[PDB]
Amino acid sequence: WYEKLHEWEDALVAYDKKMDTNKDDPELMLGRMRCLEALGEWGQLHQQCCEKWTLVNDETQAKMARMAAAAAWGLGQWDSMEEYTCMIPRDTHDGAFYRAVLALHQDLFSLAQQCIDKARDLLDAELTAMAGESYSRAYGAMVSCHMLSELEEVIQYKLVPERREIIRQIWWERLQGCQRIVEDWQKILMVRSLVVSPHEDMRTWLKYASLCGKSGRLALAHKTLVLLLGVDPSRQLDHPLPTVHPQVTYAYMKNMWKSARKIDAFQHMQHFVQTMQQQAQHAIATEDQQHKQELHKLMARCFLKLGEWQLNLQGINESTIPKVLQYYSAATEHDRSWYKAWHAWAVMNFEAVLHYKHQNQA
Amino acid sequence: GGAQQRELERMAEVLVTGEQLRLRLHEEKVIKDRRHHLKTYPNCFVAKELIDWLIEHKEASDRETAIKLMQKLADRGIIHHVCDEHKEFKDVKLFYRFRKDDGTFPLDNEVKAFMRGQRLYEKLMSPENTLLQPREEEGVKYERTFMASEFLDWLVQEGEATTRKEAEQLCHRLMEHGIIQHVSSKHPFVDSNLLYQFRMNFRRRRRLMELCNPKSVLKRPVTSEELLTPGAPYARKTFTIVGDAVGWGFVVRGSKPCHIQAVDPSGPAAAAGMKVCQFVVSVNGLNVLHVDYRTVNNLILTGPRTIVMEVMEELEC
Amino acid sequence: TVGRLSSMNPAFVMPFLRKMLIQILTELEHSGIGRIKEQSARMLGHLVSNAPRLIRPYMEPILKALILKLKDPNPGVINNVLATIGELAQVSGLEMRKWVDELFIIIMDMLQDSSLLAKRQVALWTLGQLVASTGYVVEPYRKYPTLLEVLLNFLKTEQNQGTRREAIRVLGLLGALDPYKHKVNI
Amino acid sequence: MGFGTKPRHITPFT
Ligand SMILES: O=P(O)(O)O[C@H]1[C@H](OP(=O)(O)O)[C@@H](OP(=O)(O)O)[C@H](OP(=O)(O)O)[C@@H](OP(=O)(O)O)[C@H]1OP(=O)(O)O
């Protein structure tokens, strides 16, 4: 019942109760594979499928192969995903898609072209029938053909080196029309990983981490952030946060405020904003076209965030009011023509007026 | 315990009690958000009221004792006065708040070292790090004994300090404070078997008044020599497999003999025999009896679409 | 053959190639015969489909001539100019940007409200070829609030496998917009 | 004839 509601976290614990107390037939175990695949935890999925890959029926392991292959692909173990691929039924959409992507990795471009063509006609039957009801019904299949055309651009990415500057520009706005679903973005982003690493495009993965935390699991949004930084800030607290990649570290501090570690975020934010003015200055090289405006654009957000948290943590105080006006006033001049900078500053002055009037009348 | 213990440990202990005190007070609701004349004040506790709570719980006998303890706390900075910056405890209903509630929160090298040490000690207390055990070095058994070599290994493995050099330098600072002391001579931290005794204990806080990858299929461990010898049940057969629109559908994963790992039941290979329990020695003419499985993989792919393959095909033995 | 052969020995080929190109352009704009114009367009496509480096600076004289042909106030001529634009959209990435807006109107008219059951495979194939190279992907779903509906209708009506396999590729290259934005676009 | 042959840059109409 939980799976039909797309609510996976309580589905997994429900399957755990029916299995931890007692091992049962190979149908409760297969239910978790459909739950760990949707959750996005390839570490636990691989150990379960690899251990059980032998003491199961041949027909039973045919169902497991599709979920087992995805976990190996997500973990980078290319020596074993080849094994899991060759039992996926070859007269299915997933049976050709999962072996088309296998040809790209091992550099077989002629073989992959037929597999993409063979995968298109298999999806034709599942698409024309669903399109006869409504467009909304035929969306789970249209996102599948969306990834089929993204594999043809992977071949073009690895062949002509002069196009690897607009290929990762078409991939950006083509992702702004799809529905904001974590499962949908987890599949498309995994396809665009055979060629481009996350370190080559923060602009796309940062919007993925924000979406994961905003509407889904905060745990997923946290492991994808320490992957970009290169170090895990949660392990060591006394050391300052990494300074390079100012955009990435800005998003990390927002995550801390949403979680329990509110206290840490406020202090780290003070240090970060301070270290920027020194980095902003002492720069003989001039990049006012893009970099200087980008540095200035980030300053306004940081100052705005700082003011709000100090008001949340300490309240409106006779002492606090002058402090946040310094933060808000400095934010307005860094990035003018920003609505949330002027409106917020104006409101704070208005609030200050009200407080003073109440004080001297009592 | 000398100057090292008397200074640093005492500072550590007051913080531990302040945290213990704050947690109790929050449960007791002494610190709660307040609004005075339509102006807010979060996490506030009135000074005068607190004295009553202490007397009931017996922490402070009378107003004098409570004031003295609070004055000592102020001299440290663990608390501050929200309404005014005098920050001197008074027996008046005035809102105060702990530095740990982020009103100020100054952090010193000592505080940062102590807090990390406390968190590490919780790990040591926890099963996650179970190295703490009664062990004997230099002829004496001491509790909470963990080998210095084991600790340095654990730090890298746990990831608290991935770099061993960084970890080792950090331990010296803790040793200077006295948090960890070698059981016998307090020998400085080295990657050696030296057992250590944790002088600092997290529990029993001070009182206020006192201040995997592979699977494998074939049963046979090795069949290379038996295959090489002429006399064995295996009868060799040669299979020529034609390509398909989506691929042949077979995998070879034998290190020395290159035995077939798996075959797609609906694929072309399964149609032309090609059972899982087989061994190959030559492909498209070239003899590959002694090569790695990977080397075999590259050769077969680069060849023509149709592959000439020789299968050992053991006869049910 | 010579276009491939011109890439290694340009000392002799370029003069002859330039003369041939000029003659083809003259035939397109001077000779008012439907048979001659079809012949010239097909020959031009082979030259550009085989020697892309030499043709790339010459988008402006070729593309403008082809567009004016499509707006003449004959099945043979249309099926060849549409294919030729297919190769011109691959040689010039992100360069055919000021012509895409005026090119959908010509192309979309041959797919939607097609008064004649002509060859739509050429139009469908070239439509997905000049959007995978231009990069113009999600925006066209707005100005033409009919393109998504007609592409879906092509699945059931058409029976040829070649056309069926091409209406799926165009559906993927353009995007996978959420069902709500479809409602907003009516 | 082979699975690992790179396709031509400018594919013509089939
Ligand atoms: O969710 P929020 O904390 O309020 O952050 C939002 C959000 O940014 P994220 O991408 O990090 O979630 C907006 O993005 P949308 O998802 O709504 O598209 C972004 O707007 P843009 O996409 O236009 O940049 C906006 O930025 P801005 O403040 O410049 O309007 C930014 O707000 P904060 O940076 O102030 O948190």
Which residues are CB-neighbours of A203 under 8 A, at least 6 positions away? A172
- For residue D4, list chain B residues with Cβ-Cβ distance below 8 A: 301-302
A114 burial via Cβ count (<10 Å: 0-12, 13-18, 19+)? middle
Cβ contact C68:C37 at 8 Å = no
Task: Please tell me if the CB atom of residue A210 comes closer than 6 angstroms to any atom of ligand 1.
Answer: yes
Does A103 contact D at CB distance below 8 Å? yes
What distance in Å separates the CA atoms of residue B242 and residue B308, rounded to the nearest whole number?
Answer: 9
Chain D segment 1-14 residues within 8 A of A by beta carbon are 2-7, 9
- Which residues does chain B have within 8 Å of residue D2's beta carbon, measured at their own beta carbons? 302, 304-305
Kindly report the CA angle at B282 between B277 and B283, in degrees rounded to 5? 95
Q: How far is B251 from chain D (nearest CA, A)?
A: 16
CA atoms within 13 A on the CB side of A210: 13
D13/C contact by beta carbon, under 8 A: yes
Same domain for B167 and B121, yes or no, is yes
CATH of residue B96's domain is 1.10.10.10
Same domain, yes or no, for B87 and B121?
A: no
**What 3 state SS string does chain A have?**
CCHHHCCCHHHHHHHHHHHHCCCCCCCHHHHHHHHHHHHCCHHHHHHHHHHHCCCCCHHHHHHHHHHHHHHHHHHCCHHHHHHHHCCCCCCCHHHHHHHHHHHHHCCCHHHHHHHHHHHHHHHHHHHHHHHCCCCCHHHCCHHHHHHHHHHHHHHHHHHCHHHCCCHHHHHHHCCCCCCCCHHHHHHHHHHCCCCCCHHHCHHHHHHHHHHHHHHCCHHHHHHHHHHHHCCCCCCCCCCCCCCCCHHHHHHHHHHHHHCCCHHHHHHHHHHHHHHHHHHHCCCCCCCCCCHHHHHHHHHHHHHHHHHHHHHHHHCCCCCHHHHHHHHHHHHHHHCCCCHHHHHHHHHHHHHHHHHHHHHHCC
CA angle B205, B207, B208 (to 5 degrees): 130
Report resolution (Å) to 1 decimal: 3.7
Three-state SS letters, C58-109? HHHHHHHHHHHHHCCCCHHHHHHHHHHHHHHHHHCCCCCCCCHHHHHHHHHH
Centre of ligand 1 from the C-alpha of residue A340, in Å: 11
Same domain, B54 and B77: yes
CB of C70 less than 8 A from some CB of D: no
**Do B23 and B68 share a structural domain?**
yes
Q: Are residues B122 and B181 in the same domain?
A: yes
Residue A120 in contact with ligand 1 by CB distance below 6 A: no
* C-alpha span between B312 and C7 (Å, rounded): 52
What does the alpha-carbon distance between residue C110 and residue C108 come to, in Å, rounded to a whole number? 5
What interhelical angle do A182-191 and A142-159 show, nearest 10? 20
Nearest CA to ligand 1 atom 31: A301
Please enumerate, as own/partner, the contacts of A235-238 that have beta carbons within 8 Å and a separation of 24 or more: A235/B159, A235/B160, A236/B116, A236/B160, A236/B161, A237/A264, A237/B112, A237/B115, A237/B116, A238/B107, A238/B112, A238/B113, A238/B115, A238/B116
Pairing of strands B180-182, B133-137: unpaired
DSSP strand pairing (B260-263 vs B250-252): antiparallel
**Does B119 share its domain with B201?**
yes
In angstroms, the CA B260 to CA B270 distance is 12
**CB–CB contact C132 A173 (8 Å):** no
**C13 three-state secondary structure:** helix
Report CB contact under 8 Å: A109, D7: yes
CA dist A261 to B97, B109, B111, C136, Å? 18, 21, 18, 44
How many C-beta atoms surround the C-beta of residue A49 within 10 A?
25
Is A254 labeled as ligand-binding?
yes
CA of A305 to the centre of ligand 1 (A): 12
Do B129 and B93 lie in a common domain? no
B305/D3 touch (CB, cutoff 8 Å), yes or no: yes
- Helix/strand number for chain D, H first, E second: 0, 0
Same domain, B202 and B115: yes
Q: How far does the CA of residue C183 sit from the closest CA of chain A (Å)?
A: 10
CB-neighbour burial class of residue B135 (10 A; exposed 0-12, middle 13-18, buried 19+): middle
Q: Are residues B156 and B116 part of one domain?
A: yes
Residue D7: helix, strand or coil by DSSP?
A: coil
Identify the CA nearest to A122 among candidates C144, C168, B52, B67: C168
User: How does DSSP classify residue C25?
Assistant: H
Would the annotation count A214 as a binding residue? yes
Q: Atom 30 of ligand 1 has which residue's CA nearest to it?
A: A340
Nearest to A168 by CA among A204, A131, A218: A204
Question: B170 and B115: one domain?
Answer: yes
CA distance A143 to A128: 14
Question: Looking at chain D, which residue has its C-alpha nearest residue B298?
Answer: D4
Is there an atom of ligand 1 within 6 Å of A207 CB? yes
Are B119 and B75 in the same domain? no
* Token pair listed for A311: 């008001």
Experimental technique of record: cryo-EM
Q: Which of B82, B102, B265 sits opposite A266 (nearest CB)?
A: B102
- What B233-238 contacts at long range (C-beta under 8 Å, 24+ apart), as own/partner pairs, is B233/B314, B233/B315, B233/B317, B234/B279, B234/B312, B234/B313, B234/B314, B234/B315, B234/B317, B235/B313, B235/B315, B236/B281, B236/B310, B236/B311, B236/B312, B236/B313, B237/B273, B237/B310, B237/B311, B237/B313, B238/B308, B238/B309, B238/B310, B238/B311
Selected residue of A102, A110, A163 to mutate for chain D interface (largest D Cβ count, 10 A): A110
DSSP label at residue C56: G
- State the DSSP H helix or E strand holding residue C180, giving kind and residue range, or none if neither: helix C179-184
A90 lines ligand 1 (CB under 6 A): no
CA of B88 to the centre of ligand 1 (A): 44
Which structural domain range is residue B179 located in?
109-210
Protein residue with its CA nearest to atom 29 in ligand 1? A301
Tell me which chains share at least 3 CB pairs under 8 Å with chain A: B, C, D
Residues B128 and B46 occupy one common structural domain: no
Q: How far is CA A199 from CA A176, A255, C162, in A?
A: 20, 20, 40
